[PDB]
């Protein structure tokens, strides 16, 4: 820890070093928007009751599915007043902006893999 | 550890390399082509560490046929560099520690030949004659004395041989005998294999 | 565009380079090589809480080691119409962390109507350096007047807070926030403390290393808001005396080119 | 524990045609404070050679305090003076002395040879001389000695004649230099000490630079 | 490892002033506070110290026995301020050399020939004098209110410098981590050497 | 950074020490080591300087919504049981020692503890804090029981007095508050109001 | 403390049936700031022999100071010159009795004497290696290649004196510690001559 | 780290005409494999930038400059103040922080506007910092301060101020191991730019 | 092993416990931290325990010496010297924390301390042990002046008793000793004769 | 970093006694002298832990709530000793592996369908059962005696046991680093669980 049970489209990622962090913030950074979620969602679980964080979730993933496809920037819009950010600029919309994404794949290949179909 | 270098000239690229293989303490065979082929008009010479070498020509080789088979034409040396470089530095920064030394060939058909020198940490020159590995620092100096800035094919080979035998005498190891391609505008010409008895 | 692309890029930091740099740096120290340095400015800061308003103040030399990179550095940032901060130690990282809530605030302005309040930024400023644990060192000093009353915050590279009438923060710091020690007393007047301030800032430049050159002050009084820059030149540069100039000629030359422009 | 900790300073040296030059800056800094503000480092030898010590100021007094009695022994002996020319050897033999732990200084020897010539040598921390005309070094170092290399030697120049530096072009390049150098080095600046000296005496000379 | 706090002093018209804290500190602990810290060696030279406290015990027999050996002896000389300053010198850069520290900070004050001296010796073989002078800690926090005063005034009377001495062991006593509310000092003055202590600093913690 | 609780009939007194220090140089010469979460529990600090003031914003959070959300007032035994859960659960990076205590109209008069570690336990008297542990003795010695509020003062003024001078890390003035069955009052000792020993 | 000097440099010396040349550039670094431009490193020890630098300064200097020394005592006691073989196992001796204190050196002891040249070589490791053809240093490489390439045994005068400058210059052009001046030594029967003293640019201009 | 390549640049503004000038070297610590390698790169048409650092590093941020200010000159029509791309670079540079990148870039130009000089500089992460008289960054920057103090003058015309820039250059480059062999002189006068290549020791 | 000595008027006190270790185990249960120098003066003992052992007998060696020498009682300055110059001369692996006392006929009542350190200096109470960090506050507010023997041996047990439970190196049997002007005697106190607290 | 002392067991004719000590120990100082260590998880299986006390809490916590809820659903059907102890056996080994280890060491005993049943469940992953047992420092001292009266008795009745378990605490407080005079005890008879203390041990110190 999984075994093989085409390597040019993903290459060139050798095992050893995604099982061992690299500078502290990292975990830290590349999943913040889920930590901050599953944070308040617990909190909300735990004081206010079990339907908040259901209730809550369950709009986001209403909401998620009415974007563009994948292969071009998404507005976002909606679901960030919902979220709560709306405005709390911060390092993260600043800072390589994914609009002016620098590496770009193909579109079948991105929307067939945001359907998990592969 | 091993040998690189190539000449540039009016029209040609000529590289030698050295056809050999390494272990512990023991040579497991005696030639070793390490000259991979990209198309009808560029070569790749690639020393490094053992397996990433021949994983990243493979990957990159098997690159530069696409396009050509996608777009009816083919690529020219500056855009292969510049692939190749961008290449070698997302994947070695990524998360491998590589170790490979590269040196590009090639000859389009608007500004005369190309050959390029490439480090371990993806830099990009265009020097006139350049080498790699630890026969470099033995070498160089004796390229750089007798090297008129036009040579003529016939005199590269002397050339050459002269800096082989150079190496040949006054080096630690034992690199047997060495192996020469040189590109014109008829594709990838050959010839005999340089063997010191 | 690309063959090897799954996901949809993502922004923030980046992180593609820690491995060859530790590799790299590892290559580089037992060989007695160069190594990077970054504008370590440390400065001076003082602020008082005279009887009316606000004076902030912080000396201007800009350091990068043991040279002086620069002799005219603004260590007094715009946050809102009426709060100031300023910065200690690590510029560059002080300079875009002020800078983000600057405009947060400003945005939070714009969507209430009325002037924001100092403990708003004191609490985005606490919440996003401990989220940011370490790694990012910008000590603060925060200062402002509400519509409640005079407040100062005194902000650390950690996130602790305090509520003093007066703070110096910054590697020289010692000998101004001593001079207050012995000579501030309570609900002064404006005059008194912009010369207090000042004498507090002279102290501190004469009898360190890290600051030099000219000083400036920040009074932000509830009606009338001060940006004196320069306040006093301490130190002038004397004169060249013999002439160096090199004339035409001078100089070699191998190639030239020429290419008119529109 | 370190046995070992930097105080700063500067020392630039000028040899002519017939006077030797030697100044420095005054500014005992360690850390990040200042202990003083006068601390002389250009001390007197004989009536014809001034010694100039840099570097770390716990051995710069030690070398000074024993060049003086070997100086001492040497004259009762000899029944003469040292000249500029043995104390460079002099001095070299007593820092390689303790080569297995070295002296934190740097040195500058300037003076008069035999006949009226200017002269002044520079060591190295462990020791080894070398004769120079216009070696400068020290803590702030490698900004004085380009200026001088450009003025005082002609280098990079064409189509310019050559000519002997006066004395009254001396002092008004080192004031000029020493000004320019203070303002963008932390551990220079105070008080400077000029201690010119020719075939009469040894004369001092005390200017104001970036009064602090 | 019992330390000490800063044996600060300034110069003076006709004298010295030298002070110091009654404190042993055993890290953070303040396991001992009676300890004294001035030394009378002569009849015209006055010390002080801080750092470690036996080191201190031991350079205190060492040269008051140098001392009485010399009075002893009789000739119509003593030893000036600056002798006892180089030998001190000397005698802390050679147990430097030899891997064998006295962790030790002192000043020597005196008043000679119708001049005075001040001087600082710290262990690593710093030599100088200056017309103020701080140690330990107080480098940072004392130097700078006496360096100012010298600068505009450069000579004082008895008042103003025992004036500057007290509001320096108030600002020094307000913001130290080691520090006692007591403190002695000795003035040098030509009629001799006169220790005076303890003392006291009334403090004012009206802006709490 | 000494800090204690003790408990009598009707309510409880609270003090502390304003000398946070950043080693051997003071930071700030007077704070406010004790913060009035919601209207009568009161919360007290240790350790660091940065996570106990998180750990208290988030307290403060979750049970002003707790309180408001049951119409009823708070319950000590919460406030607790938050500490406690927040506490343990981060027991990697959150090295904050912590003493809570406050009225509460059932059964009035509670003081708790809960050191680095997370563990929760409630006692008479509680002490916690780098310079508190040289009046162990005296406080054994000297807590009898059955003490109104004006000695319980008193004993508290004694016995932080104490630890105030035999330490580095205590030093200036003192911040008693005694929170009881109608409301909360606060006093600060200072000059020679402070006992002397 | 700091970088002694001389972190690397280049030399060279070949014998033929005219003695035996030495050539040697000046570039006294400290790390990465050059500290001299015309520092010698031939050492003359007497009028028949040529002590070569390289590795560290201070210690070539000195080491060589001591076999000047011992060579004229035993010149003054046998009334016979000494043979260079008994030199070089001197300094063999004298440098191999430290070792791995960090003692670096490299030197060449060369000259001509009853049995002729001779061109022994010794270093800080202890091995006293004879030959032909030497060239130590950092710059050693790209001169050696040269070198070995035009070194025949039966050439003439100005050619091995071009040969040297030739090499010199490719191995400055291609380092990057070597460079400044140029200087060439001669030996024969009477003793060492100076041949002449160049400057990288003028060779550059005139090899364009 | 900026030792394992070398470079040099410098910028003075003089009287509506800004200078930069650069050195031509790349090598692998002792070694040198070239004596051509490009340091200044003509982003816009009067306006400059003089990376020098690690090579390795500079490539790649010049192209990525180089993108950026492609696709912003495009969308928003004119031309690109020279201020602006002071803040590009800035950001161009926080965006890795925490993996830092190895470039001390130099920016010179004029405005398309006014055509009144300007001259910045950054450090290694980003810091914005304007002066007016000058400013200098490379491997070598501690034997540059020096030369540069004193020779500077007010108000030069573009005769003086190429001197100047060469006799600031020429001579206080030489004295350091590596970054050396080779000037590239840029002047940018109000109307037509113009390119000089000195000669220097080759050593 | 808290160790403790209080000065009255014409004598001095002086206590101990019996609970020499080696980690957490317990070495030995019942012992005698308490060696008689000569026949009026008393020397604890702290920190190792075979290095005070030899420290104590070149001690009793040497004083000895002396006071046969001179043919006078010893003065309990000269056991304070020793014990200051044969501590001080070793400070590199003599760790071993004393305490002595002792009566003389000329200003009778002395207790001295010498810390580890070799530093040496008088005061009228003195404290030593690695569990010896807890009762200052209590000795502090409690130590008055103008006791006589009874009230002192009180104060001593009370005290020493504190710190006999909040500890774990310290428990067991307490070991008073009084030196007075006439002689010496001594009593354990052992049991519920242990004051509670 | 609070912890325990010792937490063993010896087996019974229908039923197991479990003895603990009320201590709670930060490093080497007593912080806290009231805190219990024992449980009453149902009313046929009773607990001990020792180690830290935080998660002993937690567990405790966890535990309680399974208990209950299985208690609330309603079947007629209750956990088995060797059902809670196979769980914690689970738990225990899962965090091992995990590398977030529980610094804890636990005592099982109950007495379910006639029988009485006793386990170890060590941080490691230990377990097994036992006629006896001890934990943390008392598998040295603890151990010995009721091995050897169990050896010589397989079987007892509730007066000597509870005499070994006094002699047993005798003994661990005369010779611990970490040990109080006060002491819980609870027997597990078919009855219920009875938690009962503080109890008392009277000592003799006339070796003296």
Not at chain 3, 47 to 65: F, P
Not at chain 7, 76 to 100: C, D, F, H, P, T
Not at chain 8, 64 to 72: A, D, G, P, T
Not at chain 8, 77 to 89: A, F, H, N
Request: charged share 20%; glycine share 8%; proline share 4%.
């Amino acid at each position: 820890s999984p075994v093989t049970e085409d390597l040019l489209r993903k290459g060139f990622s050798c095992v050893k070093n995604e099982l061992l962090p690299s500078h502290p913030l990292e975990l830290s950074e590349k999943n913040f928007q889920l930590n901050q979620d599953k944070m308040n969602f617990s909190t909300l679980r735990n004081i206010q009751g079990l339907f908040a964080p259901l209730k809550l979730q369950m709009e986001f993933k209403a909401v998620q599915q009415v974007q563009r496809l994948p292969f071009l920037s998404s507005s976002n819009l909606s679901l960030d007043v919902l979220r709560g950010n709306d405005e709390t600029i911060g390092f993260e919309d600043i800072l390589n902006d994914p609009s002016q994404s620098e590496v770009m794949g193909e579109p079948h290949l991105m929307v067939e893999y945001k359907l998990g179909l592969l | 550890m091993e040998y690189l270098i190539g000449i540039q000239g009016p029209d040609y690229v000529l590289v030698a390399s050295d056809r050999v293989a390494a272990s512990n303490i023991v040579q497991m065979k005696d030639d070793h082509d390490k000259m991979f082929k990209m198309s009808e008009k560029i070569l790749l010479l690639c020393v490094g560490e053992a397996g990433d070498t021949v994983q990243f020509a493979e990957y990159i080789q098997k690159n530069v046929q696409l396009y050509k088979m996608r777009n009816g034409y083919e690529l020219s040396p500056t855009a292969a560099a510049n692939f190749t470089r961008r290449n070698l530095a997302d994947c070695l920064r990524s998360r491998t520690p590589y170790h490979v030394n590269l040196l590009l060939a090639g000859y389009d058909e608007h500004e005369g030949p190309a050959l390029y020198y490439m480090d371990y940490l993806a830099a990009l020159a265009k020097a006139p004659f350049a080498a790699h590995g630890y026969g470099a620092f033995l070498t160089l100096s004796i390229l750089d004395r007798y090297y008129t800035p036009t040579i003529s094919r016939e005199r590269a080979v002397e050339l050459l041989r002269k800096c082989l035998e150079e190496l040949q005498k006054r080096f630690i190891l034992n690199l047997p005998t060495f192996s020469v391609r040189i590109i014109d505008k008829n594709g990838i010409h050959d010839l005999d294999n340089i063997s010191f008895p | 565009a690309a063959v090897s692309v799954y996901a949809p890029p993502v922004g923030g930091f980046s992180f593609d380079n820690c491995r060859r740099n530790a590799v790299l740096e590892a290559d580089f120290a037992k060989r007695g090589y160069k190594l990077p340095k970054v504008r370590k400015t440390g400065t001076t800061i003082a602020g008082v809480v005279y009887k009316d308003g606000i004076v902030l103040g912080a000396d201007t030399r800009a350091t990068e080691g043991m040279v002086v990179a620069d002799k005219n550095c603004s260590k007094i940032h715009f946050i809102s119409p009426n709060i100031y901060c300023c910065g200690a130690g690590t510029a560059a990282d002080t300079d875009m962390t002020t800078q983000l809530i600057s405009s947060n605030l400003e945005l939070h302005s714009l969507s209430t109507g009325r002037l924001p309040r100092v403990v708003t930024a004191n609490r985005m400023l606490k919440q996003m350096l401990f989220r940011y644990q370490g790694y990012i060192g910008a000590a603060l000093v925060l200062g402002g007047v509400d519509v409640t009353g005079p407040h100062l915050y005194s902000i650390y590279p950690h996130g602790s807070t305090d509520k003093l009438p007066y703070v110096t923060m910054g590697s020289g710091s010692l000998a101004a926030m001593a001079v207050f020690e012995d000579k501030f007393r309570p609900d002064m007047e404006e005059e008194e403390a912009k010369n207090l301030v000042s004498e507090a800032i002279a102290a501190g430049i004469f009898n360190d290393l890290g600051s030099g050159s000219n000083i400036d002050l920040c009074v932000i009084s509830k009606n009338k808001l001060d940006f004196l820059r320069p306040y006093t030149v301490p130190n002038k540069k004397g004169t060249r005396l013999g002439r160096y100039r090199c004339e035409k000629g001078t100089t070699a030359v191998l190639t030239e080119k020429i290419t008119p422009l529109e | 524990f370190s046995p070992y900790v930097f105080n700063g300073g500067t020392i630039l040296a000028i040899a002519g045609e017939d006077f030797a030059i030697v100044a420095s800056d005054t500014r005992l800094s360690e850390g990040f404070s200042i202990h003083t503000r006068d601390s002389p480092k250009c001390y007197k030898l004989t009536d014809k050679t001034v010694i100039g010590c840099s570097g770390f100021h716990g051995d710069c007094l030690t070398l000074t305090k024993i060049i003086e009695a070997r100086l001492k022994m040497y004259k009762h002996s000899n029944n003469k003076a040292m000249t500029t020319g043995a104390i460079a050897a002099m001095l070299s033999t007593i820092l390689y002395s303790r080569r297995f732990f070295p002296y934190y200084v740097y040195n500058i020897i300037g003076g008069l040879d035999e006949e009226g010539k200017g002269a002044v040598y520079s060591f190295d921390p462990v020791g080894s001389y070398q004769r120079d005309s216009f070696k400068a070094g020290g803590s702030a170092s490698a900004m004085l000695q380009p200026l001088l290399d450009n003025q005082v030697g002609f280098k990079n120049m064409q189509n310019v004649e050559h000519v002997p530096l006066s004395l009254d072009r001396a002092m008004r390049l080192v004031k000029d230099v020493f000004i320019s150098a203070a303002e963008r080095d932390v551990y220079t600046g105070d008080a400077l000490r000029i201690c010119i000296v020719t075939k009469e005496g040894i004369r001092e000379e005390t200017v104001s630079l970036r009064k602090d | 490892m019992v330390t000490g706090t800063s044996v600060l002093g300034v110069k003076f018209e006709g004298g010295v002033v030298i002070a110091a804290d009654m404190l042993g500190s055993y890290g953070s602990l303040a396991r001992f506070r009676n300890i004294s810290r001035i030394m009378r060696v002569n009849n015209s030279t006055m010390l002080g110290a801080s750092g470690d406290y036996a080191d201190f015990q031991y350079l205190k027999q060492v040269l008051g026995q140098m001392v009485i050996d010399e009075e002893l002896l009789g000739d119509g000389h003593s030893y000036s301020p600056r002798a006892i300053h180089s030998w001190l010198t000397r005698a802390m850069y050679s147990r430097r050399s030899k891997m064998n520290p006295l962790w030790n900070t002192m000043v020597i004050g005196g008043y000679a020939d119708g001049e005075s001296f001040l001087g600082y010796v710290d262990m690593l073989g710093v030599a100088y004098e200056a017309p103020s002078l701080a140690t330990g800690y107080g480098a940072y926090l004392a130097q700078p209110l006496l360096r100012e005063v010298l600068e505009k005034q450069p000579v004082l009377s008895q008042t103003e410098a025992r004036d500057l001495v007290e509001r320096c062991m108030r600002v020094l006593y307000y913001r130290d981590a080691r520090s006692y509310n007591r403190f002695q000092t000795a003035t040098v003055t030509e009629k001799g050497v006169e220790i005076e202590g303890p003392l006291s600093t009334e403090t004012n913690w009206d802006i709490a | 950074t000494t800090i204690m609780a003790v408990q009598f009939d009707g309510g409880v007194v609270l003090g502390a020490d304003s000398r946070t220090t950043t080693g051997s140089y003071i930071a700030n010469r007077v704070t406010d080591k004790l913060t009035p979460i919601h209207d009568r529990i009161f919360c007290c600090r240790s350790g660091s300087a940065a996570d106990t003031q998180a750990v208290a914003d988030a307290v403060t959070y979750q049970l002003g919504f707790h309180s408001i959300e049951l119409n009823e007032p708070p319950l000590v035994h919460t406030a607790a049981s938050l500490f406690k859960e927040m506490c343990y659960r981060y027991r990697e990076d959150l090295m904050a020692g912590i003493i809570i205590a406050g009225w509460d109209p059932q059964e009035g008069g509670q003081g708790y503890s809960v050191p680095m570690g997370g563990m929760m336990v409630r006692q008479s008297f509680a002490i916690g804090g780098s310079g508190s542990s040289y009046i162990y003795g005296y406080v054994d010695a000297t807590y009898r029981e059955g003490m109104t509020k004006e000695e319980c003062l008193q004993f508290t003024a004694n016995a932080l007095a104490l630890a105030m001078e035999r330490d580095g890390s205590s030093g200036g003035v003192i911040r008693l508050a005694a929170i009881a069955e109608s409301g909360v009052e606060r006093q600060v000792l200072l000059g020679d109001q402070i006992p002397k020993f | 403390p700091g970088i002694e000097m001389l972190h690397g440099t280049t030399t060279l010396a070949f014998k033929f049936r005219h003695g035996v040349i030495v050539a040697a550039d000046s570039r006294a670094t400290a790390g990465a700031y050059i500290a001299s431009q015309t520092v010698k490193k031939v050492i003359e020890i007497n009028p028949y022999l040529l002590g070569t630098m390289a590795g560290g300064a201070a210690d070539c200097s000195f080491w060589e100071r001591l076999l000047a020394r011992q060579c004229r005592i035993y010149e003054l006691r046998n009334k016979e010159r000494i043979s260079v073989a008994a030199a070089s196992k001197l300094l063999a001796n004298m440098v191999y009795q430290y070792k791995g204190m960090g003692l670096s050196m490299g030197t060449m002891i060369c000259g001509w004497d009853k049995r002729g040249p001779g061109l022994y070589y010794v270093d800080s490791e202890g091995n006293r290696i004879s030959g032909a053809t030497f060239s130590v240093g950092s710059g050693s490489v790209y001169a050696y290649g040269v070198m070995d390439r035009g070194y025949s045994y039966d050439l003439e005068v100005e050619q091995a004196y071009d040969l040297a400058r030739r090499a010199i210059y490719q191995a400055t052009y291609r380092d990057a510690y070597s460079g400044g001046a140029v200087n060439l030594y001669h030996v024969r029967e009477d003793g060492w001559i100076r041949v002449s003293s160049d400057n990288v640019a003028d060779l550059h201009e005139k090899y364009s | 780290i900026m030792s394992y390549n070398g470079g040099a640049v410098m910028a003075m503004k003089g009287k509506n005409c800004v200078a930069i000038a650069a050195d031509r070297r790349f090598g692998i610590q002792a070694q040198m494999v070239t004596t051509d390698f490009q340091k200044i790169f003509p982003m816009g048409d009067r306006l400059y930038i003089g990376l020098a650092g690690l090579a390795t590093d500079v490539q790649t941020v010049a192209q990525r400059l180089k993108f950026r200010l492609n696709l912003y000159e495009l969308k928003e029509g004119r031309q690109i103040k020279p201020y602006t791309l002071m803040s590009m670079v800035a950001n161009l540079l926080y965006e890795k922080r925490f993996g830092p990148y190895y470039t001390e870039p130099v920016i010179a130009g004029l405005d398309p506007k006014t055509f009144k000089p300007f001259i910045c500089s950054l450090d290694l992460i980003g810091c914005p910092m304007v002066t007016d008289d000058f400013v200098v960054s490379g491997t070598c920057a501690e034997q540059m301060y020096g030369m540069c103090e004193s020779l500077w003058e007010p108000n030069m015309d573009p005769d003086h101020l190429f001197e100047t820039i060469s006799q600031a250059m020429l001579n206080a480059v030489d004295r350091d191991a590596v970054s050396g062999m080779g000037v590239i002189v840029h002047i940018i006068e109000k109307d037509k730019i113009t390119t000089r290549t000195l000669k220097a020791r080759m050593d």
